[PDB]
RNA sequence: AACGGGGCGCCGCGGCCUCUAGUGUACCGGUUGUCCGGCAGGGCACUGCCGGGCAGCCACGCCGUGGGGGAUAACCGCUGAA
């Protein structure tokens with residue numbers, strides 16, 4: 001359909017200061033600061049008009065189609081994650097599951113290393129991005145923390161992907177005559193806030 | 196079975212001549228028939244034939260011949276509204 005005018009409002013929580021800067025004809029840079037840190041997000045080439053009103057972020061589209069109107073809900077959802085990111089933080093939880101070979105997960109500096117995955121001599125090494133903290137709880141659980149939910153979720157997804165074999169190395173998911181097969185890996189199990 | 200780690204080929208490409216192999220009517224030797232009287236030296240038999248062989252050329256010989264980065268394909272995912 002067609003939208004003459006549509007508006008959305010995102011209430012800024014207490015202690016959070018939001019700055020909106022126009023870096024181009026339709027580009028925006030939104031800086032969000034809270035007790036837990038500062039996030040910076042870019043909204044480039046966008047039809048959404050972004051503005052501040054006494055403690056809210058106002059999002060508007062004018063003369064918009066479905067494509068442009070759909071971006072109001074998206075930007076509201078992104079901004080809400082930013083506000084919760086600087087007040088409560090984001091924690092993604094992962095579970096280590098093995099069948100015969102116990103995996104050894106350790107964090108050394110800014111490297112996350114997984115050893116003995118399926119008894120392989122190769123070592124899975126991942127680079128931990130700035131703003132992400134990884135802690136290994138016992139032998140079964142991994143926790144990824146940060147203020148940028150996109151950054152934190154993406155890294156947690158990378159850990160899970162690193163243990164998913166592809167091509168000729170992919171094991172059969174089901175066993176003989178239909179039981180569970182070789183299902184080893186690290187699986188993202190859920191998320192929650194730090195506070 | 197596999198990832199990872201270690202070692203080496205085959206095919207192709209580019210060079211090289213130290214080794215080995217081929218050639219080598221440069222060169223040295225042996226020897227057949229005849230002719231120059233004999234010896235020695237030599238002509239011809241299209242290097243007469245046979246053996247060896249430097250240089251050069253050469254392969255059947257030796258040497259070199261890789262990893263990375265970027266954007267992507269098939270797609271797999273994150274966040275994410277309509």
Ligand SMILES: [Mg+2]
Pocket residue numbers: none
């Ligand atoms: Mg050649």
Ligand SMILES: [Mg+2]
Pocket residue numbers: none
């Ligand atoms: Mg000869």
Ligand SMILES: [Mg+2]
Pocket residue numbers: none
């Ligand atoms: Mg004589």
Ligand SMILES: [Mg+2]
Pocket residue numbers: 238
């Ligand atoms: Mg004569």
Ligand SMILES: [Mg+2]
Pocket residue numbers: none
């Ligand atoms: Mg002659």
